[PDB]
């Protein structure tokens, strides 16, 4: 292990405004193979109860963002600004 | 999981201490045990 690439995914029910009844988490599990010939993998499990937050979402974001092919360019221009939009 | 606002009683508010400027008299021991620090010497002393 030296990273994920987690392709999760939780159910949250709330009691209230902001902390949630419980957290249910399953999703799956990620990271390099070999000789860049990748093959399956496995997955995860988690439960909670009255929580402000989910551990293993938060865990993956604090750690880093994700695969993000989005990195916003400099500085804008226009594209097709004015009256003819 | 538990969020900031439960676990910030976990920990205690301690005093914050000050002063206590007394005068402090010499303390007056009692006559039973300042009859034992001097023996037999009552009434002996002008006080005057």
Redesign the interface.
Known sequence: FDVLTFRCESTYKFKSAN?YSSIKTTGQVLLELPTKEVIQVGSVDYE?GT???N?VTDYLSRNGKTIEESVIFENAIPLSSGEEL | ????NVDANYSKVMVEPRANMKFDFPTLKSYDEIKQIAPELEGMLDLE
């Open positions: 902390v909670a929580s402000y937050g551990p | 999981v538990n969020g900031d």
